[PDB]
Homo-oligomer: A and B are copies of this chain.
Amino acid sequence: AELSTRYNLPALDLNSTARWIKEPSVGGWTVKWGNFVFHIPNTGMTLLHHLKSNFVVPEWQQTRNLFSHLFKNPKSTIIEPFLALRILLGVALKDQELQQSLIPGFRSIVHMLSEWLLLEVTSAIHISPNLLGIYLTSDMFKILMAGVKNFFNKMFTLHVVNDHGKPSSIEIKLTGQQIIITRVNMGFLVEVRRIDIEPETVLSESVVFGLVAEAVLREHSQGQPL
């Protein structure tokens, strides 16, 4: 046997950044944002729910122990993978390497977008054409997309959880909620610890988490959707 290339490949819409177009497709969903087309599978949802039970075969108990706050805490809730991707994108927009070559006006726009992705589930954010008309240039759009791909790429530098002191996670605080992204065998576990405000006003610690399949990000980390 030997390595060989047989199936190798042969060698605008600015307002798309303000849209979050989710739509069901074969094997899951498609989400369009910017010039990215995300293909989200239904993978792991059944497993994730089952792992919150303590009546799992012994091989899964280590997993439940490692993520106690997620699996051995009944109060934590599982979110759909496309919501977890949305959260992941919100984090990417705040990447230090991305916001370093942006103009301040557009930087503040990116900030609004980031908050919209992290805190909301709405399909659109409305920003005044006055700010977009001077700050959202083709260059800034290009850089923004290049930055997100770059963040996806550095996520693949993460090692899957291991027993030999290797960085398996990325932690960040954004708009009053601790976000943790961990690489597992199935992809990236996206975990958010926030404070929920329930209407007398009552504040409580809340934990949500979802699983973004590796293929979702690998498609946009370096082609074809397969």
Q: Which residues of A pack against B, CB within 8 Å?
A: 1-11, 25-27, 37, 41-44, 46-47, 50-51, 55-57, 59-60, 62-63, 66-67, 91, 94-96, 158, 160-172, 180, 182, 184-187, 189, 214-215, 218-219, 222-226
Contacts of A2 in B (CB 8 A): 170-172
**Known interface pairs A66-B224, A224-B184. Does A8 touch B168 (Cβ–Cβ under 8 Å)?**
yes
Contacts of A59 in B (CB 8 A): 37, 225
Q: Is the pair A5, B184 in contact by a Cβ cutoff of 8 Å?
A: no
Q: How far is the CA of A158 from the CA of B6 in the complex (A)?
A: 12
Contacts of A41 in B (CB 8 A): 43-44, 186
Contacts of A95 in B (CB 8 A): 1
Contacts of A4 in B (CB 8 A): 167-171, 180
Q: How far is the CA of A34 from the CA of B165 in the complex (A)?
A: 28
Q: Is the pair A160, B218 in contact by a Cβ cutoff of 8 Å?
A: yes
Q: Is the pair B9, A161 in contact by a Cβ cutoff of 8 Å?
A: yes
Contact pick for A185, options B37, B182, B218, CB 8 Å: B218
Q: Is the pair B44, A9 in contact by a Cβ cutoff of 8 Å?
A: no
Q: How far is the CA of A25 from the CA of B51 in the complex (A)?
A: 12
Q: Is the pair B96, A56 in contact by a Cβ cutoff of 8 Å?
A: no
30 contacts between A and B (CB under 8 A): A1-B96, A3-B158, A3-B170, A4-B167, A4-B168, A4-B171, A5-B168, A5-B169, A6-B180, A6-B182, A7-B169, A8-B162, A8-B164, A9-B162, A26-B47, A27-B47, A27-B50, A42-B43, A43-B43, A62-B224, A62-B225, A63-B226, A66-B224, A160-B223, A161-B223, A161-B226, A185-B215, A185-B224, A186-B226, A189-B226
